[PDB]
Amino acid sequence: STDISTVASPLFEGTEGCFLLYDASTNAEIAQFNKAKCATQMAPDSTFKIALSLMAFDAEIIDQKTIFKWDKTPKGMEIWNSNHTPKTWMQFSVVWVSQEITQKIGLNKIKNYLKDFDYGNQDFSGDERNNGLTEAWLESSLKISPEEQIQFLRKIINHNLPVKNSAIENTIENMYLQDLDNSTKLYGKTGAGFTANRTLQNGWFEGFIISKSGHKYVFVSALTGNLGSNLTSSIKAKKNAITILNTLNL
Amino acid sequence: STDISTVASPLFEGTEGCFLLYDASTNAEIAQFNKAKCATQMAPDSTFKIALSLMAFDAEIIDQKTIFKWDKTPKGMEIWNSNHTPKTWMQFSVVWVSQEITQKIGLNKIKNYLKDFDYGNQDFSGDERNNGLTEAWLESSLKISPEEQIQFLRKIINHNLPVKNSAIENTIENMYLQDLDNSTKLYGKTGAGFTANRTLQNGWFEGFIISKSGHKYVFVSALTGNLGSNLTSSIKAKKNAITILNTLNL
């Protein structure tokens, strides 16, 4: 695992950052930054939509033609106040869609999926408000580390999970974002939130990259730090990931 | 037409009652009782929710999935002290939901809908207290007669109103109550209140009936009288309507 601190350190200055890049098929570490932070678990926040998408498609509760209907009540973010699809649900981190999905699947089935995915601490208890089904993955009980997310991403693209193959590929397709400088394809998902009872912000940007040659890799960019009252932790994590990926020219 | 005094008289004894049944499509009068009372305008009270439902769905401020959140303060009736849906709003005559809707739509828009609906005296000025927006339809400024309500109901089911077709059908669906003795389907809404500055009670029960053959009709059962301090005018109007409709066997 080539240490890329020389390029990553300036990008993460002012925060506790981490970056990991692994080969999809062999699990060989290609590049890393601040392994200590990489082993620390924290709320997955919206990156949990990757797992929820797998569950929703596998359970056959949604398909690519599904249209989630807005209930006309303000959700807190204007882009959330409209109808969505499985694709835009991921793109805009539409929490209310996730909540409709968890309610349909049920707590028991979610717990079973968490074991299948070996998802971090697998704690979906939430906060005594019994709000697990609606917020367990949002700066709540559920926690997972960047290292653990890497392995989860590997199992997905390698099809080493007990779920429909189509559930996996439909989820990956819905994560497509853009092509990098050298044409490498980028598929990813952001996640962000404020640490409970503190001012700190946590941020994630993780996913897959497919080189023009066809070689596949998985990556995770994460950080925790004081970035003010505006949630920009995932914007920063994503920007840093793209900068690093283009520099590595993989 | 058809005078049904023989059956209606005892049912309305002790009050000034009225009953009207018209063919939806042709406007032919099928049955009637005490036309003098039928031509008298009075506050629509909760039957106004039929109009508000049309406005809310047409303006797209509510969806069948919408959940109205109780503000946690005592409302006067225990069934109102809970969260509601567009269906239970009608079912339990939840006034606070109507008030949230009128404030969202705004006075100017309400005035335009009143013209579109040719709704009685169209007076939404209320009481001084500048409370028209939240109380005009409750034994206040707004008045409409049973004959006028019949024509409004006809325009609804015949889709002769300048509003979305879905707004009309969603409203009718939310008015469904039960099937009558011969399988005819009953859709309706109650309304009741005390006459301002008097001891009298006004009551309404109106809506649509769809025979098993598919033939549609509109009806209105209304009354005004001294029934004590317990508001039972709409309970009586509804009971009388169902008794009459079953006897007519339509």
- 10 Å Cβ neighbour count for B154? 20
A73 touches chain B (CB under 8 A): yes
Residue A224: which of A212, A238, A216, A234 has the closest Cα? A234
Sheet-wide strand order for B16-23? B29-33, B16-23, B216-225, B201-210, B185-194, B176-179
> Would you say A203 and A237 are in contact if contact means Cβ atoms under 8 Å apart?
yes
**Whole-angstrom Cα distance, residue A179 to residue A173?**
13
Structure tokens belonging to residue B221: 């059962």
Residue B232: which of B198, B195, B190, B203 has the closest Cα? B203
**Whole-angstrom Cα distance, residue B5 to residue A244?**
88
**Whole-angstrom Cα distance, residue B24 to residue B105?**
29
User: Could you please report the per-residue DSSP string of chain A?
Assistant: -EE-HHHHHHHHTTSEEEEEEEETTT--EEEEE-HHHHT--B--GGGGHHHHHHHHHHTTS--TT--BPP-SS--SSGGGSS-B-HHHHHHTT-HHHHHHHHHHH-HHHHHHHHHHHT-TT----------HHHHTTSSSS--B-HHHHHHHHHHHHTT-SSS-HHHHHHHHHTTEEEE-TTS-EEEEEEEEEEPTTSS-EEEEEEEEEE-TT--EEEEEEEEEE---SS--HHHHHHHHHHHHHHHHT-
Nearest CA in chain B to A81: B61
> Would you say A219 and A47 are in contact if contact means Cβ atoms under 8 Å apart?
no
Distance from CA of A79 to the nearest CA of B (A): 17
Give B11-14 contacts, CB < 8 A, sequence gap 24+.
B11/B239, B11/B240, B11/B243, B11/B244, B12/B223, B12/B240, B14/B225, B14/B226, B14/B227
What was the experiment behind these coordinates? X-ray
> Would you say B47 and B187 are in contact if contact means Cβ atoms under 8 Å apart?
no
Instruction: Give the CATH number for residue B90.
Output: 3.40.710.10
Report residue A42: phi and psi, to 5°.
Answer: -155, 165
> Would you say A163 and A58 are in contact if contact means Cβ atoms under 8 Å apart?
yes
Residue A19: which of A240, A190, A187, A227 has the closest Cα? A240
Buried b (16+ CB within 10 A) or exposed e, A171-190: bbebbbbeebeeebebbbbb
> Would you say A60 and A74 are in contact if contact means Cβ atoms under 8 Å apart?
no
B1 touches chain A (CB under 8 A): no
Query: Is A46 flagged in the annotation as binding?
Result: yes
**Whole-angstrom Cα distance, residue A172 to residue B248?**
63
Suggest the residue from B57, B63, B87 to mutate for an interface test with chain A (most A CBs closer than 10 A): B63
Is residue B125 annotated as a catalytic residue, yes or no? no
Number of domains chain B contains: 1
Q: Encode chain B in three state secondary structure.
A: CCECHHHHHHHHCCCEEEEEEEECCCCCEEEEECHHHHCCCECCHHHHHHHHHHHHHHCCCCCCCCCECCCCCCCCCHHHCCCECHHHHHHCCCHHHHHHHHHHHCHHHHHHHHHHHCCCCCCCCCCCCCCHHHHCCCCCCCCECHHHHHHHHHHHHCCCCCCCHHHHHHHHHCCEEEECCCCCEEEEEEEEEECCCCCCEEEEEEEEEECCCCCEEEEEEEEEECCCCCCCHHHHHHHHHHHHHHHHCC
State which residues form the domain around A41.
1-250
Structure tokens belonging to residue B101: 């809707």
**Whole-angstrom Cα distance, residue A241 to residue A221?**
6
Looking at beta carbons, which residues of chain A come within 8 Å of B62?
72
> Would you say A179 and A186 are in contact if contact means Cβ atoms under 8 Å apart?
yes
B62 touches chain A (CB under 8 A): yes
How far from A124 is each of A102, A115, A127, A128, B159, CA to CA, in Å?
A: 11, 12, 9, 13, 49
> Would you say A77 and A28 are in contact if contact means Cβ atoms under 8 Å apart?
no
Residue A222: which of A12, A9, A22, A48 has the closest Cα? A12
**Whole-angstrom Cα distance, residue A143 to residue A159?**
23
How far from A160 is each of A63, A118, A207, B95, B190, CA to CA, in Å?
A: 22, 12, 16, 55, 60
Nearest CA in chain A to B69: A73
**Whole-angstrom Cα distance, residue B151 to residue B147?**
7
Distance from CA of B61 to the nearest CA of A (A): 6
B65 touches chain A (CB under 8 A): yes
**Whole-angstrom Cα distance, residue B203 to residue B93?**
13
